[PDB]
């Protein structure tokens, strides 16, 4: 049965540890892939960790956009190894989600001026999208959002240090049935974290051009969209300035470059996942700002520590658990964090929102390099 | 279908070898986890070995309460390897059981003053329990007991060398529906081995404070509890004095510290699993005392050898096979023994009670260190 | 349910990347088989990569027609390893297909003067064919074609540098129900790539004797056959001359030896997969010739690059995805390419025909030898 | 559904290769168990290779009746590795079969004077048999035979160089319902290969005492037994004299010691599997003697080579494929051969009887030691 996607996110007061793979620590001895850009997506049975291999193992001489890059997947918490990974697609940029029946896998491969997204429904190639700007066609590196048998994603074509072109897709059974281009001047969308919420999709993305806060786009199933920036003075991107008065436009200070991130909108509130360090991808914390989606101030109410400030962090993205998997009446918000080491490789930790008691700690990668 | 849990333990005269993994012997060459505190729990289909990894492999430079510790599981008798282990939870103290529908996993992680138990039902986080004494919240390191769709566990918070606080939980579908604190002055409960028996639960635990006999707590589904010590002069803990006249207050002699153990109450009798050595965790034997639950004498009738006195042993715990798995009219009592080597790592052997003919032997770990 | 096989190939304008295993790159560190002659076949659930192991691993002292050669299989895109490969048959020449119910595996083993094909239906030996010329009995090294519960293959017995004997088989549930010998003087058929197309089978094969174009044989379910050569001046075999005027007979120039290949007939058109280099097995491209099946000219309309001319290629073969797997109204044409390295070992890439937008690139093996 | 076991063996004219694992060749690099005494048994879905591990891997310093010995199993043709083996029982002598519902596993462990057979039905301990002579209780090292939900085996207790005691068991759902002791003076039964045939069981065994021909015992489901020797002058055991006039008392010449073997009775005929060498366990051949079960002469009609005389062979045993697995009207006879290398370890090859065309060859282990 298709995931309905019509329930709301239920409110959460903290984040509870869900998975940790210990990939690099195991890969010091075992045969473990060199992976980058991991993300989590859940079927109505299980959650799976998706990752981009380089086609190489840790502690080997074979260890950005190469033809050897493939999207693979393992059960959540298991180490990514060639003996337990399932192949998904050839991809140096990827997205994947489950509509309640089968997996949809989106894999981008090809040259920088001619990249093509290959869409797979239950392992069968069902559609392709070619690059429309011929400057690095790229996608979420996180799970697409599925509402009522339609899955949705955001793709970006154009420069990563300037104005690019952003497209929203509706995908039914692996087939593109509607695409719209976002008219967003002075905005910049990269590597969006998208989640379903009451038949709507909300994406929170990376402004690599000139934004140290995070842009967002929300749209309905007919892809009528709204855009804006997260107005909180608690800035989400990395690099970023120290916390100050925010704005609902792109904040210029330390706005160049960035990191893939996420946020969860709760009315006017927002749960913000961000690095602890404002200069490097070090540490991770979750911050509850009861007015941060629209209000410019730098006052919050809850801060939970995820990764210690002296430990390496990286990409972070959102994923959801639908009521068809949990049996609840709401959609549970969850997120993953990539812990980048170094070769360059990464492990992953994942958290889910709960209303019960939580604690902060540091769950770092822990490999002795 | 939920496990009923209303049949009684059937009487057994001996213990028959069920599984042996040979973990360290294999891990000299293969990629095998460094594991500690293994335990066994059975679904209506199969039995599974649960274990705490350190996130490290044998014969590697990465080899108590760390954020890298995770609860994992393998089919019984198989070596714990990253290529065949299923991830369960992040945990440096754990418990797990199957109510007949899905697995319930309890995983404790966090700091010593702020640890939180994360409860998972079919891989979904369903509840959390925060520490109420802020001194190392800890649990069974063995299977919880499930009666009629409710699973039960005992948790301890407080000092391990003095009076602590002990709580009994009732858990339905991963949700705590009733918890009670045990009023047990001069008692000390650690790492309880709990089993169902005629709709009631019996736990036999470790007195780390001052007790060389083993404390016990029994309770019904509404958590009305009774407490006591095992009165037999055949003492169960390790370290322990030589066998003498017992009591069922806590026996002070060699009472400090201890080892996780188990016992099976049969009316007034008791099957006692214990180390052969009274000073170290060496050897293992099963002793049938027909009056040992209530009587203070040191006379028994059956002794079966499990591990030889010159071989290393360790933690031991109980698990059961419900009639829904065996097709019998009784609940079969079974137990595992951890064989600790050294890094510090452990293999496991497991036995099940039968009324047919048995033999004693030594089934040690066998790795040449 | 049996695959009907009665729909036609749907027209395609390009080829989209489907799988890439990165076998040798992984096998530099992991335990990966030394494999040769891989091919792909799909069940109504999944596609599988079949391969001939030498019974040896990469980077080992143990690394054509040996008794240690076995046919094995893995899920598509996964590395061929002894820990995830399924054993299929003992074979130094093989074919395999799925009729919609069970796998049919054909495995040839034995001496050069006495080889016997062993037919297996769902792992059970169901029939054998002995050699009728006693000079290396051999088969497709690609998937057999199944129409309406009957699977079809072509076998060759006799010299590979001269006139041999070619037989077409009809196989129902692993049992040979009809075989016919092809009366084909001056023709030479080796390692045929066969596909179903509207209840009929079309095979495109290798002329190792005197042909640099590719011979073909088409037949109905009663094995009434037609034969010919692909008339296009775009020659398909390797070694081959430079493109010139073709012929519907065997083209003598550079006609000796060859490589296993494929083609897809579309009325009078043909999709030709071939090496880029005319002298060695280097590179790969797909060429659309709208009249190439019957017309002798060297003019085409579409050329898509698959493997770069400086990268090693090898055997190529065809496979299909039936409507019972894709849910479409047509049979999707697909092909694989073996990338040969060096020991001698090979990885594999695979493509499927689509009518959407595609790009050319190079997806080579990538191992640093 | 239970296997009926009431059809007859259908006549076969040759033996076709079924599986070959290439264990030692792979284990030079990969993590492959050191195994001994492999055997094959088939469920109504699949066939499985059962083997006794030493709890040690090839190419490791950890590499007869030890407590570390365990019965494990893999799918047929796959290498025995800790990452794909299923644990079955603790055992230094074993037997296993499938009654059509679940696996029955028999595992003998314990000391030489106190060994106990542990019977497991679907992984649950269901019965035990203790040693009745206290001199190495031992069993088939091959598959038990199941007829109509009852599985049958032969066990031996007593000296291996003299008169011992032999018992036939009937086992229903893992429970012994009838055992009978064979009154067999001057006979010696070791490591019987038993097969069902028209609701009756026939076992062909090893005379380690004074017999170079092979003893046999046949019995119905009520264990009314008949005994004898194979009267053919084609002797089956190894060591053995050169072929001469036989008898069906025990043939004294070279009668001491032996090797586990098998034979298939076809009325008065017999298919004899035996080593080529009369002094060592070298080579293997299958010999059809149309009167060899009862007639003393040394004339046969068919000889098929299995393993070359310069290659190592070892234990050989029989297994069957029931009509519920093949869909045929008869029970297909099949056999395996262990190829012993050296540590001491072994690979396995397996053959099934067919009435189609076969060839002889050598399929040796092939590891370069
Ligand atoms: C700005 C997004 C994007 C623009 C192309 O770059 C991504 C890159 N994505 C791709 C498709 O290569 C990803 N592999 C990881 C990155 C990273 O670690 O920051 C980014 N790299 C740089 C140099 O910013
Ligand atoms: C007394 C129980 C408990 C009190 C905290 O200590 C456990 C410990 N449990 C935890 C939660 O760390 C466990 N890993 C193993 C132990 C062991 O091998 O004896 C114990 N260690 C010591 C120093 O006694
Ligand atoms: C001409 C086909 C065939 C004739 C016997 O030879 C095949 C060979 N097939 C067999 C059955 O051995 C295959 N392993 C690979 C080949 C290759 O890489 O070209 C061929 N080898 C040579 C020397 O041409
Ligand atoms: C005669 C059967 C039996 C009598 C005890 O001995 C078996 C042995 N079986 C057991 C139970 O150990 C088996 N592992 C392999 C043997 C072998 O390779 O020949 C035999 N060994 C010797 C010394 O003959
Ligand atoms: C979502 O829709 C389903 C039917 O599609 C309905 O049963 C359910 O109540 C809806 N839930 C909410 C929260 O609106
Ligand atoms: C346990 O309860 C079930 C119903 O829940 C009943 O059928 C069964 O007989 C009971 N068993 C015992 C041993 O009391
Ligand atoms: C193929 O046969 C089936 C019957 O199984 C029929 O329904 C189908 O329409 C046929 N295909 C075409 C293209 O007509
Ligand atoms: C075997 O038994 C089944 C029923 O158990 C019966 O249908 C079948 O005819 C029997 N076969 C023979 C050959 O007796
Ligand atoms: Ca930025
Ligand atoms: Ca104590
Ligand atoms: Ca040629
Ligand atoms: Ca003998």
- Every domain of chain D and the residues it spans: 1-363
Residue of B193, B130, B136, B192 lying closest to B162 (CA atoms): B136
CA C218 vs CA A284, C181, C197, C316, D334: distances in Å: 64, 13, 10, 19, 39
Cα distance between residue B287 and residue B233, in whole Å? 12
User: Is the separation of the CB atoms in D146 and D140 below 8 Å?
Assistant: no
Cβ neighbours of residue C205 closer than 8 Å, sequence gap 6 or more: C154, C189, C190, C191, C192, C193, C214, C215, C216, C217
Q: What are phi and psi of D221, to 5 degrees?
A: -65, -20
Q: Tell which of B71, B112, B125 to mutate to test the A interface (max A CBs under 10 Å).
A: B125
DSSP code at position D202: E
Identify the three-state secondary structure at position C326: helix
Closest CA to A333 of A230, A232, A262: A262
If you compute the radius of gyration of chain C from its CA atoms, what whole number of angstroms results? 19
The response to whether C99 counts as a known ligand-binding position is no
Between CA D35 and CA D336 the distance in angstroms is 15
CA distance B51 to B35: 6
Nearest-CA distance C46 → chain A (Å)? 8
Interface size between A and C, measured as CB pairs under 8 A: 109
Does C42 reach chain A within 8 Å, measured CB to CB? no
**For residue A94, which of A120, A130, A126 has the smallest C-alpha distance?**
A120
Q: From the alpha carbon of C198, which atom of ligand 7 is closest?
A: 13
Resolution in A: 2.0
If you measure CA to CA, which chain A residue comes closest to B82? A79
Is B268 in contact with B293 (CB distance < 8 Å)?
A: yes
Residues 6+ apart with CB under 8 A from A338: A36, A37, A38, A313, A314, A315, A316, A346, A347, A348
Shortest-distance Cα residue to atom 8 of ligand 3:
C64
Count CB atoms within 10 A of the CB of residue D25: 27
Cα atoms in the Cβ-side hemisphere of radius 13 Å centred on B296: 8
Whether the upstream peptide bond of residue D181 has omega within 30° of 0, thus cis, is no
In degrees, rounded to 5, the angle at the alpha carbon of residue D54 between the alpha carbons of residues D53 and D56 is 100
Would you say the CB of residue A65 lies under 6 angstroms from ligand 1?
Answer: yes
Q: Which residues of D touch B325 (CB under 8 A)?
A: 124
Ligand 5 atom nearest the C-alpha of A148 is 5
Sign of the dihedral through C-alpha A82, A86, A90, A93: negative
Distances (CA, A) of D249 to D182, D205, D215, D274: 16, 14, 9, 19
D213 phi and psi, to 5 degrees? -85, 175
A196 CA distance to ligand 5 centroid (A)? 14
Residue C89 CB contacts under 8 Å (≥ 6 apart), including other chains: C70, C71, C105, C106, C107, C109, C118, C120, D17
Contact A116, A130 (CB under 8 A): yes
Subunit contact A16:B125, Cβ cutoff 8 A: yes
Instruction: Return d(Cα C128, Cα C131) in angstroms, integer.
Output: 10
Q: In DSSP terms, which residues pair with C333 in a beta bridge?
A: C320
Residue in D83, D86, D109 nearest the CB of B17: D109
Rounded (10°) CA dihedral B228, B229, B233, B234? 130
Interacting residues of B277 by C-beta distance below 8 A, sequence separation 6+:
B238, B283, B309
Token output for D352:
């099934």
**Atom 8 of ligand 7 has which residue's CA nearest to it?**
C6
- Of the CA atoms within 13 Å of residue C281, those in its CB half-sphere come to 18
Q: What is the tally of helices (H) and strands (E) in chain C?
A: 2, 24
**CA distance linking residue B155 with residue C80, whole number of Å:** 47
Which chain A residue's Cα is nearest to C325? A124
**Listed residue (B281, B331, B269) closest to B306, CA to CA:** B281
Sole residue written with tokens 């049935």: A177
Output the DSSP codes for C235-300: --SSS---S----SS---TT-SS----EEEEETTEEEEEE-S-SSSSEEEEEEEETTTTT------
Rounded Cα distance between C310 and C280, Å, is 10
Ligand 9 centroid distance, CA of A183 (Å): 20
The C-alpha of C90 sits at a distance from chain D's nearest C-alpha, in angstroms, of 6
A364 touches chain B (CB under 8 A): yes
User: What protein residues have CB closer than 5 angstroms to ion ligand 11?
Assistant: C 207, 211, 237, 255, 258
Could you give the CA distance from residue B140 to residue B105 in angstroms, rounded to a whole number? Answer: 12
Residue C320 pairs with which residues in a beta bridge?
C333
- The dihedral through the CA atoms of D21, D25, D29, D32 has a sign that is positive
- Output the CA C141–ligand 11 centroid distance in Å: 17
Could you tell me the distance, in angstroms and rounded to a whole number, from the CA of residue D237 to the centre of ligand 4? 14
Residue D202 sits at φ, ψ, to 5 deg, of -125, 125
- Known active-site residue A127: no
């Amino acid at each position: 049965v298709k995931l309905a996607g019509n329930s709301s996110l239920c409110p959460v007061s903290g984040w509870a540890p869900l998975s940790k793979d210990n990939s690099v620590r195991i890969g010091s001895k075992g045969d473990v892939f060199v992976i980058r850009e991991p993300f989590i997506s859940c079927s109505p049975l299980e959650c799976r960790t998706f990752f981009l291999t380089q086609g190489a193992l840790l502690n080997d001489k074979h260890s950005d956009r190469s033809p050897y890059r493939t999207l693979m997947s393992v059960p959540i918490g298991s180490v990514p190894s060639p003996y337990n990974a399932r192949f998904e697609s050839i991809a140096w940029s990827a997205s994947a989600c489950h509509d309640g029946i089968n997996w949809l896998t989106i894999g981008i491969t090809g040259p920088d001026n001619g990249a093509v997204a290959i869409l797979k429904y239950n392992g069968i190639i069902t559609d392709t999208i070619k690059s429309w700007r011929n400057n690095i066609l790229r996608t979420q590196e996180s799970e697409c959002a599925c509402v009522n048998g339609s899955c949705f994603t955001v793709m970006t074509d154009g420069p990563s240090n300037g104005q690019a072109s952003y497209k929203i897709f509706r995908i039914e059974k692996g087939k593109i049935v509607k695409s719209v281009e976002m008219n967003a001047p002075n905005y910049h969308y990269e590597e969006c974290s998208c989640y379903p919420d009451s038949s709507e999709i909300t994406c929170v993305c990376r402004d690599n051009w000139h934004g140290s806060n995070r842009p967002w786009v929300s749209f309905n199933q007919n892809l009528e969209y709204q855009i804006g920036y997260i107005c909180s003075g608690i800035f989400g991107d990395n690099p970023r300035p120290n916390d100050k008065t925010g704005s609902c436009g792109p904040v210029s200070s330390n706005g160049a470059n960035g990191v893939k991130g996420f946020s969860f909108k709760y009315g006017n509130g927002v749960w913000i996942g961000r690095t602890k360090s404002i200069s490097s991808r070090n540490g991770f914390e979750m911050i509850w700002d009861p007015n941060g989606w629209t209000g410019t101030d730098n006052n919050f109410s809850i801060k939970q520590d995820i990764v210690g400030i002296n430990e390496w962090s990286g990409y972070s993205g959102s994923f959801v658990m639908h009521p068809e998997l949990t049996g609840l009446d709401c959609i549970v918000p969850c997120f993953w964090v990539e812990l980048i080491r170094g070769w360059t490789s990464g492990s992953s930790i994942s958290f889910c929102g709960v209303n019960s008691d939580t604690v902060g700690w540091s769950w770092p990668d822990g490999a002795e390099l």
